[PDB]
mmCIF file with all atom_site columns, C-alpha atoms and ligand atoms in Angstrom:
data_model
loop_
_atom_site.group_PDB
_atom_site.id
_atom_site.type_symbol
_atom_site.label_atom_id
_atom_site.label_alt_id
_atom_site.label_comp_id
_atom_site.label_asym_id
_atom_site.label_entity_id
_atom_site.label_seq_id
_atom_site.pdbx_PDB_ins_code
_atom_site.Cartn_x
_atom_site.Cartn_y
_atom_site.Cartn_z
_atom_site.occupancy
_atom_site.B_iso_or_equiv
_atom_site.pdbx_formal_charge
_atom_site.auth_seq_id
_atom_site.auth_comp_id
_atom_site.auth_asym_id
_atom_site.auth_atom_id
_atom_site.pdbx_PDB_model_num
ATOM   1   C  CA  . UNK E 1 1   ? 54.221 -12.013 -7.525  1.00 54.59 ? 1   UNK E CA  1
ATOM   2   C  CA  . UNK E 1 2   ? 55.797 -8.454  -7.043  1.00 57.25 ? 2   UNK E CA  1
ATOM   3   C  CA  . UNK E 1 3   ? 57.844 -10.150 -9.704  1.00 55.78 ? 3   UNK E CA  1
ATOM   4   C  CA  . UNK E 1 4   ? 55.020 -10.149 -12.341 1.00 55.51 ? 4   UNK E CA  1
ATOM   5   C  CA  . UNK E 1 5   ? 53.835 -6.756  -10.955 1.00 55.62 ? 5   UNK E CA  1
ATOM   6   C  CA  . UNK E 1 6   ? 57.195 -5.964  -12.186 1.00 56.77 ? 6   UNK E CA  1
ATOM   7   C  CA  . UNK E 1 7   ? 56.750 -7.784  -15.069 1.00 59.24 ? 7   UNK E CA  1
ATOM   8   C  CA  . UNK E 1 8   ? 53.292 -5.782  -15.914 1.00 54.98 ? 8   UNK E CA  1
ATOM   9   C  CA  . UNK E 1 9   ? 55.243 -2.396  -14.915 1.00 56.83 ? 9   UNK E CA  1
ATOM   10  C  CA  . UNK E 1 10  ? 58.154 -3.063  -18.426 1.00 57.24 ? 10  UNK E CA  1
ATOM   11  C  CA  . UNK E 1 11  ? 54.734 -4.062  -20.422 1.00 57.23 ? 11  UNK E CA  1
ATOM   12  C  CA  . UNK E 1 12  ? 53.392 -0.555  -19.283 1.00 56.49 ? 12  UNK E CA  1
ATOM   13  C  CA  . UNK E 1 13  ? 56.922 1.153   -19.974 1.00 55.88 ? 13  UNK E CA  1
ATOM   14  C  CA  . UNK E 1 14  ? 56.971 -0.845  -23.927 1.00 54.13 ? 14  UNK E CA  1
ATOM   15  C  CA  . UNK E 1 15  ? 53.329 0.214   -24.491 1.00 55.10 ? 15  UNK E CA  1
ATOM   16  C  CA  . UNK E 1 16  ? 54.638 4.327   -23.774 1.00 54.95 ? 16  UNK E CA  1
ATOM   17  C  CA  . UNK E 1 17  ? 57.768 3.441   -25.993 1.00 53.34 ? 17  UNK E CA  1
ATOM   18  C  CA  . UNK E 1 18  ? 58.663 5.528   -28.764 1.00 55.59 ? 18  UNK E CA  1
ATOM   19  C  CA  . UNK E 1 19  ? 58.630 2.159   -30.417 1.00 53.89 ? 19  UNK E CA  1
ATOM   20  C  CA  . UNK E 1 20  ? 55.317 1.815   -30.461 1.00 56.31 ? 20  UNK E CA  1
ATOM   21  C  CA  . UNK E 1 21  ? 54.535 5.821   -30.474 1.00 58.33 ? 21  UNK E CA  1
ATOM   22  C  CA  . UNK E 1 22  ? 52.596 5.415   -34.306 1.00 57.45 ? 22  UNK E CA  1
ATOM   23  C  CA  . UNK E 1 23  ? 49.693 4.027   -32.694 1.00 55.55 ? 23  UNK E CA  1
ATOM   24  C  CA  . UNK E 1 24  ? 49.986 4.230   -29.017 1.00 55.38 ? 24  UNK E CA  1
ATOM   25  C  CA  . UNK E 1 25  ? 49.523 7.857   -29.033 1.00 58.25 ? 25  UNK E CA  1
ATOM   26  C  CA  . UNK E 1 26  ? 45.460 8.131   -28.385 1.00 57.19 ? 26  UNK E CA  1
ATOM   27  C  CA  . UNK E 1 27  ? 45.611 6.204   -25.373 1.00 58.87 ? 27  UNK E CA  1
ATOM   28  C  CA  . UNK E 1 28  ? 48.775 8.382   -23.354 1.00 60.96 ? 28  UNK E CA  1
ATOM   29  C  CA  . UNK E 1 29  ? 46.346 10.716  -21.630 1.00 63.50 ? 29  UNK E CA  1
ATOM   30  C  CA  . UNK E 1 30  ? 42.474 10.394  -20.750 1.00 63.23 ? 30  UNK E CA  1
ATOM   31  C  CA  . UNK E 1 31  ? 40.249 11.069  -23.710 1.00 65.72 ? 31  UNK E CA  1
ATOM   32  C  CA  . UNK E 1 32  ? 39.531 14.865  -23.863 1.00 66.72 ? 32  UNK E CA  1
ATOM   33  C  CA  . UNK E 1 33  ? 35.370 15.199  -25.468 1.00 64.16 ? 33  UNK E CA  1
ATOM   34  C  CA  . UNK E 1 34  ? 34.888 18.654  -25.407 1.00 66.03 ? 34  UNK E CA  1
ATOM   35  C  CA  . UNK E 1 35  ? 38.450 18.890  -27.305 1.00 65.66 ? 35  UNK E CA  1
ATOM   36  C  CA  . UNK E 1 36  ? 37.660 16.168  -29.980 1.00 66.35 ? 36  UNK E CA  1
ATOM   37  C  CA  . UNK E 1 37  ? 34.070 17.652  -30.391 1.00 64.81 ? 37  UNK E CA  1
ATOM   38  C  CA  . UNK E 1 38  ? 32.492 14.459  -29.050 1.00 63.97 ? 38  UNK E CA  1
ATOM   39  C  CA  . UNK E 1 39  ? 29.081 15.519  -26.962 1.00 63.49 ? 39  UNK E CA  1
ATOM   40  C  CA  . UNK E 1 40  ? 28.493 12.025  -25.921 1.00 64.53 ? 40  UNK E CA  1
ATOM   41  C  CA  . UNK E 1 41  ? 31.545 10.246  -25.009 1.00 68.68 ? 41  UNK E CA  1
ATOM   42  C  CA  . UNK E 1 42  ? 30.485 10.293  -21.347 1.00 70.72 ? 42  UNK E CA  1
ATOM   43  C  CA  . UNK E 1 43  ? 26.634 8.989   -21.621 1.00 68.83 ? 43  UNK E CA  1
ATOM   44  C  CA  . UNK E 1 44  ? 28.332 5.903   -23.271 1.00 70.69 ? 44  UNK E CA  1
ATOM   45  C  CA  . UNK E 1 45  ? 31.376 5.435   -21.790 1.00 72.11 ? 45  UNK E CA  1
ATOM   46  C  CA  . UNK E 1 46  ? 30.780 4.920   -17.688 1.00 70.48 ? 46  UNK E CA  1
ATOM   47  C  CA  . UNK E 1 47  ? 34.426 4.355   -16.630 1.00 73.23 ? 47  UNK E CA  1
ATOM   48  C  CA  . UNK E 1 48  ? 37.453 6.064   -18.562 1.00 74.51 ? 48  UNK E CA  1
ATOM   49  C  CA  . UNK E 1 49  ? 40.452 4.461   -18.771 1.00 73.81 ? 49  UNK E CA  1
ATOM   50  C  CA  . UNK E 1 50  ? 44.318 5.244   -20.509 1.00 74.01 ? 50  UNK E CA  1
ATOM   51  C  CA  . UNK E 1 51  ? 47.929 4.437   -20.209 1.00 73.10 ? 51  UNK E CA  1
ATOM   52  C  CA  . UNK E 1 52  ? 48.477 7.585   -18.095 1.00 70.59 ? 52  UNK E CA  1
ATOM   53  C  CA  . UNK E 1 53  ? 46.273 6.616   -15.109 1.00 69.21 ? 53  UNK E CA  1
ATOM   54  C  CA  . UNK E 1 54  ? 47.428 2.934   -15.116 1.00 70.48 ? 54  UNK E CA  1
ATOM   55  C  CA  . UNK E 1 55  ? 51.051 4.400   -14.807 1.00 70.41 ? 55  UNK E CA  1
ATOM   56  C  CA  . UNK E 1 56  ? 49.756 6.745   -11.521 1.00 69.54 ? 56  UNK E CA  1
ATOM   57  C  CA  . UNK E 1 57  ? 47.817 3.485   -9.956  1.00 67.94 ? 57  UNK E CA  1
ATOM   58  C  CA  . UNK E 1 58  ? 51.277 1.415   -10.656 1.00 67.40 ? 58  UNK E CA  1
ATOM   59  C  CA  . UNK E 1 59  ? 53.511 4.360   -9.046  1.00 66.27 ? 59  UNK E CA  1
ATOM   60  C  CA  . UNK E 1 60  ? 51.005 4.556   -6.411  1.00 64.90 ? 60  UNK E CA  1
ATOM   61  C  CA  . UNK E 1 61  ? 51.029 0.800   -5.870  1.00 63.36 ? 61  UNK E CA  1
ATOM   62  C  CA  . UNK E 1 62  ? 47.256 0.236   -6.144  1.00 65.41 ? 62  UNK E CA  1
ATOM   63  C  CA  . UNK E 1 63  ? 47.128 -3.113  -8.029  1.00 61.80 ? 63  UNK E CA  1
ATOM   64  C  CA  . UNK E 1 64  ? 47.045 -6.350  -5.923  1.00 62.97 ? 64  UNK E CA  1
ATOM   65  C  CA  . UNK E 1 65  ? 47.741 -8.516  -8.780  1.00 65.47 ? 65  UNK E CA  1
ATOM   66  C  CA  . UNK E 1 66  ? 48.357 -8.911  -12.571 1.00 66.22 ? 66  UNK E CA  1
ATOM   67  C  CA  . UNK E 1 67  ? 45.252 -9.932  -13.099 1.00 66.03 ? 67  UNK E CA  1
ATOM   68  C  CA  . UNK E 1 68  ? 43.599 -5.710  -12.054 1.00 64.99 ? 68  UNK E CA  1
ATOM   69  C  CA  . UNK E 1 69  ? 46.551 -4.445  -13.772 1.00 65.01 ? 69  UNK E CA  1
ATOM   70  C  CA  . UNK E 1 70  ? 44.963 -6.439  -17.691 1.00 65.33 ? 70  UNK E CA  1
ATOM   71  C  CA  . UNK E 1 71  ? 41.473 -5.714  -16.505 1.00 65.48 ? 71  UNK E CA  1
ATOM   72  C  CA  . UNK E 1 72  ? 42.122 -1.760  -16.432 1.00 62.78 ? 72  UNK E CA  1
ATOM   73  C  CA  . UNK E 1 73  ? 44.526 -1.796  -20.245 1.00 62.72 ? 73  UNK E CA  1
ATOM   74  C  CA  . UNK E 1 74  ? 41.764 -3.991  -21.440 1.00 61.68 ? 74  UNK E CA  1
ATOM   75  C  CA  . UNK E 1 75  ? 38.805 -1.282  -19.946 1.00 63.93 ? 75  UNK E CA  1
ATOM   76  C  CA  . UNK E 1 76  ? 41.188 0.848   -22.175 1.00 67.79 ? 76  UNK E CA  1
ATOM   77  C  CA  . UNK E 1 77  ? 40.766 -0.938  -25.266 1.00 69.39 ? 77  UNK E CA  1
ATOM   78  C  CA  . UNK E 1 78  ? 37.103 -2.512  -24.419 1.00 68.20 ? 78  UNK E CA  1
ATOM   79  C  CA  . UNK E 1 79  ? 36.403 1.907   -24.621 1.00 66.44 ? 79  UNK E CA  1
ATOM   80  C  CA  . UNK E 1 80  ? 37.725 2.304   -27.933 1.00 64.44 ? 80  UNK E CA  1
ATOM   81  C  CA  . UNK E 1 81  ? 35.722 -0.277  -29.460 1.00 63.67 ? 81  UNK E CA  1
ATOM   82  C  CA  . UNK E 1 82  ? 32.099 0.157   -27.499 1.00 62.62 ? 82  UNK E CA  1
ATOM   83  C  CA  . UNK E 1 83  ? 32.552 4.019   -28.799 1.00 62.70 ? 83  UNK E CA  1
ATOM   84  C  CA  . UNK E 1 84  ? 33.957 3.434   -32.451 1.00 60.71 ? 84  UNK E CA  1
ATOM   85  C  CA  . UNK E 1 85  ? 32.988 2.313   -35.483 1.00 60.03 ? 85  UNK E CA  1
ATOM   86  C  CA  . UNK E 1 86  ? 34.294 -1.301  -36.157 1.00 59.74 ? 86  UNK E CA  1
ATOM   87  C  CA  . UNK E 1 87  ? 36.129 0.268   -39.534 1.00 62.71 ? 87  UNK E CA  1
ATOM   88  C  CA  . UNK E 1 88  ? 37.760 3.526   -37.713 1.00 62.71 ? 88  UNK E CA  1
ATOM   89  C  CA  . UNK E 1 89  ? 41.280 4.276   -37.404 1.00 67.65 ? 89  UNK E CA  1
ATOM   90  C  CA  . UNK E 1 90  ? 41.346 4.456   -34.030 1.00 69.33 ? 90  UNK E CA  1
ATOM   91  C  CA  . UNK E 1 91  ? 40.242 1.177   -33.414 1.00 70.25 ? 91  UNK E CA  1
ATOM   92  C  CA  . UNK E 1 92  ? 42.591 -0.060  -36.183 1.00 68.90 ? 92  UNK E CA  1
ATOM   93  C  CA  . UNK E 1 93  ? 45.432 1.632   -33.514 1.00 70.33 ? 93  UNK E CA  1
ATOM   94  C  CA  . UNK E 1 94  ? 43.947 -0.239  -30.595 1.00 65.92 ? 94  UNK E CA  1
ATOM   95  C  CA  . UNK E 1 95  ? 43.825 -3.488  -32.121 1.00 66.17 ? 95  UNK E CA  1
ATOM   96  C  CA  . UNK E 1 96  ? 47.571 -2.489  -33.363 1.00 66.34 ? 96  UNK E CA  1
ATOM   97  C  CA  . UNK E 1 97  ? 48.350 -1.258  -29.549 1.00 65.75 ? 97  UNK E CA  1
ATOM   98  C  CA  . UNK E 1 98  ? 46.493 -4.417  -28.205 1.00 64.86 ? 98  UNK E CA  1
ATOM   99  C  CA  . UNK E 1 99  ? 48.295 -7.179  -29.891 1.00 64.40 ? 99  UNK E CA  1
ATOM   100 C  CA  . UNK E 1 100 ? 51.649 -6.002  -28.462 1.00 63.75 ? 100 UNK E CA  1
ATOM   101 C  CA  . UNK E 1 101 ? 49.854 -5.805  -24.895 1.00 64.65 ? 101 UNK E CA  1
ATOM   102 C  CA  . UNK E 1 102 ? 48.494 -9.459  -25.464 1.00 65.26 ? 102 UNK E CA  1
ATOM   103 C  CA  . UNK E 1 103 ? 51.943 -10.883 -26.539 1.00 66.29 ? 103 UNK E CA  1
ATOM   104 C  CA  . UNK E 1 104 ? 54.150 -9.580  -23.512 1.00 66.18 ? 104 UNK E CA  1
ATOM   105 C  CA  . UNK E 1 105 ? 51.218 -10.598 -20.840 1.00 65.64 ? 105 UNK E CA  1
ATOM   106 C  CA  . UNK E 1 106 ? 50.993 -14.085 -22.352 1.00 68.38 ? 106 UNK E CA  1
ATOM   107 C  CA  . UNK E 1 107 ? 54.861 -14.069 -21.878 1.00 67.65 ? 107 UNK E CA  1
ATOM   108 C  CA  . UNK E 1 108 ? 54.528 -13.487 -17.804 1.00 69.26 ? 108 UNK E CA  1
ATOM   109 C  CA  . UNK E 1 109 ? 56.354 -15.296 -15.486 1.00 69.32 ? 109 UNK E CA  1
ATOM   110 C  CA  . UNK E 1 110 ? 53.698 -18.110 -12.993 1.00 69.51 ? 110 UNK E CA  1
HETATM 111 C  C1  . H7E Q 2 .   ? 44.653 12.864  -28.531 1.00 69.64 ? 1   H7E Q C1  1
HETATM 112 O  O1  . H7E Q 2 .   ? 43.761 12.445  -29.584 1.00 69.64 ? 1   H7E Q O1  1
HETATM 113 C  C2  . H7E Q 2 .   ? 42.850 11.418  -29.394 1.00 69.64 ? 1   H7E Q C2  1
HETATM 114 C  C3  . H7E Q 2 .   ? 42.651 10.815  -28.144 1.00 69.64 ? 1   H7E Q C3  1
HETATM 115 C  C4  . H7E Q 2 .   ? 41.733 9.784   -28.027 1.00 69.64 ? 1   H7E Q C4  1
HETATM 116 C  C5  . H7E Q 2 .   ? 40.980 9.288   -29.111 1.00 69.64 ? 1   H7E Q C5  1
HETATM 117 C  C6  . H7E Q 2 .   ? 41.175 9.914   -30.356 1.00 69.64 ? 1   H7E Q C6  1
HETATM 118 C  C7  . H7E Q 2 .   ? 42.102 10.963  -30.476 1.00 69.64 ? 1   H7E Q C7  1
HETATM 119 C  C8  . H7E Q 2 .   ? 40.438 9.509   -31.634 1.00 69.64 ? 1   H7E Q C8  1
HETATM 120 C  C9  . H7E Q 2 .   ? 41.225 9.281   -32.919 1.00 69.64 ? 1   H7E Q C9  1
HETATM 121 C  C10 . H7E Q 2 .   ? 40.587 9.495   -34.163 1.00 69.64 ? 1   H7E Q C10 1
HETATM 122 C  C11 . H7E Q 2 .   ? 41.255 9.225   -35.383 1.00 69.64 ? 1   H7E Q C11 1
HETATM 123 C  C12 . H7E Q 2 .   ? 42.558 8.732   -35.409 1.00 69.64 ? 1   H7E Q C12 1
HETATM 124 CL CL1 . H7E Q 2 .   ? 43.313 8.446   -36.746 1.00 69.64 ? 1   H7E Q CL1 1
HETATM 125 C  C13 . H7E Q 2 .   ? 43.181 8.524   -34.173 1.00 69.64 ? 1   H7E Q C13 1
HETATM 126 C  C14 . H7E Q 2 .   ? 42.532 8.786   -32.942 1.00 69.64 ? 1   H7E Q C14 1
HETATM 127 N  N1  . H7E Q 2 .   ? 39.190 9.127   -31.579 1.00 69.64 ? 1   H7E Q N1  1
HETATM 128 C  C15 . H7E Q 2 .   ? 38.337 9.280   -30.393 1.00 69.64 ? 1   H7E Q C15 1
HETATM 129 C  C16 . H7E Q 2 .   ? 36.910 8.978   -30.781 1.00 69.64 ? 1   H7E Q C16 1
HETATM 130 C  C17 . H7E Q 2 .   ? 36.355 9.822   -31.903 1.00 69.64 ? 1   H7E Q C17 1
HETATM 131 O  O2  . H7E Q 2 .   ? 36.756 10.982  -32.047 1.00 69.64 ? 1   H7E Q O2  1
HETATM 132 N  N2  . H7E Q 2 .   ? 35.466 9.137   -32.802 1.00 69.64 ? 1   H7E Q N2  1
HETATM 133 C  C18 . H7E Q 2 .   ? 34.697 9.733   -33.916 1.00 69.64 ? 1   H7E Q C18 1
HETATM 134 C  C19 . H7E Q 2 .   ? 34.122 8.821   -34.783 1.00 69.64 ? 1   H7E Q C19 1
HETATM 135 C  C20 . H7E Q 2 .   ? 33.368 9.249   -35.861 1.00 69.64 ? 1   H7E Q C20 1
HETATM 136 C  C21 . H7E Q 2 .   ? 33.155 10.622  -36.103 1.00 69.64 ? 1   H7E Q C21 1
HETATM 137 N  N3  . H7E Q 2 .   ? 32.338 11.141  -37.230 1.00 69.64 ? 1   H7E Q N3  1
HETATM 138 C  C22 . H7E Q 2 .   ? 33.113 12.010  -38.210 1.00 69.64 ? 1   H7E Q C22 1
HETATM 139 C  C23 . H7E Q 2 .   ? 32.070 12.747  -39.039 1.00 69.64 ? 1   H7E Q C23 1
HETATM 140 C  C24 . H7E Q 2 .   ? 31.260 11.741  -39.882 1.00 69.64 ? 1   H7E Q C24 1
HETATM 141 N  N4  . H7E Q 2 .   ? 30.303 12.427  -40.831 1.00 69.64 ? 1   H7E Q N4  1
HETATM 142 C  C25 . H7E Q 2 .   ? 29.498 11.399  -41.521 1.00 69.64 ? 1   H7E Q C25 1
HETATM 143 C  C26 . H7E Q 2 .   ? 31.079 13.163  -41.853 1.00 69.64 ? 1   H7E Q C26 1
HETATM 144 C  C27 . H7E Q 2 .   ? 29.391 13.380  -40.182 1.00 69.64 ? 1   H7E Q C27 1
HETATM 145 C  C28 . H7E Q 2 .   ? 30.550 10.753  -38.922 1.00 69.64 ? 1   H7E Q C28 1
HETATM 146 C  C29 . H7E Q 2 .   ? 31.543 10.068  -37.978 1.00 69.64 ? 1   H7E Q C29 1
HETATM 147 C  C30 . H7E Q 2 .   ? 33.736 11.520  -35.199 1.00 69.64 ? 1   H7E Q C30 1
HETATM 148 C  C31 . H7E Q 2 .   ? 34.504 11.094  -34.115 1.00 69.64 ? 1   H7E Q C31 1
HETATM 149 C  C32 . H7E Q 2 .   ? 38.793 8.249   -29.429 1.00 69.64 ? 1   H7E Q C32 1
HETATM 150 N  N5  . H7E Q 2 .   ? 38.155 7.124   -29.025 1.00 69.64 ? 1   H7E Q N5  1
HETATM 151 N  N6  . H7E Q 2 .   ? 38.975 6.434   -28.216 1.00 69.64 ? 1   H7E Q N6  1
HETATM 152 C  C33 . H7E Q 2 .   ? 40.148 7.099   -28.088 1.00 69.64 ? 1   H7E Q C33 1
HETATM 153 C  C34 . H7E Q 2 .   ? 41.344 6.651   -27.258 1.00 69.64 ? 1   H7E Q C34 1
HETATM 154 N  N7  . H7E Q 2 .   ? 40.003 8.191   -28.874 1.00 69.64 ? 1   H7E Q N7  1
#
């Protein structure tokens, strides 16, 4: 299975794509409260997660298996949604971001 580590690494490399870039954008780099205005992202949200920190655990080699590479993009998502409105735009781009995610890790090599 370093082959579907490899596998997860082109999902990670689609998801930062400029084809996806209209609604992938919010999750490239951590979420920034104090720049957004937000003075309680961090008394909700325990464990930050986004597609810039799964890329430095996959350089680094820190997953075991596919299986912590989905839990951490899905602790991306799961975020968006605990924090959000179900009607906001943002989670409209997760849900947009997400579906792509879910298609390609369905599609991993056993
Ligand atoms: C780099 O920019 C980023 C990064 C991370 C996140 C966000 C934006 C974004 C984001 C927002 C909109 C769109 Cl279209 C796209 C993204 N959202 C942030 C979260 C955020 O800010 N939510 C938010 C929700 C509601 C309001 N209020 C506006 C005033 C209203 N009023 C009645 C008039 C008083 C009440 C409701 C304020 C803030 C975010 N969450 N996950 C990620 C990733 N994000």
């Amino acid at each position: 299975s370093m082959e579907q580590l490899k596998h997860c690494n082109g999902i990670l490399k689609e998801l930062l794509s400029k084809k996806h870039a209209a609604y992938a954008w919010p999750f490239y780099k951590p979420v920034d409260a104090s720049a957004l205005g937000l003075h309680d992202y961090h008394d909700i949200i325990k464990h930050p997660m986004d597609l810039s920190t799964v890329k430095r655990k996959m350089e680094n080699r820190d997953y075991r298996d596919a299986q912590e590479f989905a839990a951490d993009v899905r602790l991306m998502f799961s975020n968006c949604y605990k924090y959000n409105p179900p009607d906001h735009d943002v989670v409209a781009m997760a849900r947009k971001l997400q579906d792509v995610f879910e298609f390609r890790y369905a599609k991993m090599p056993d």
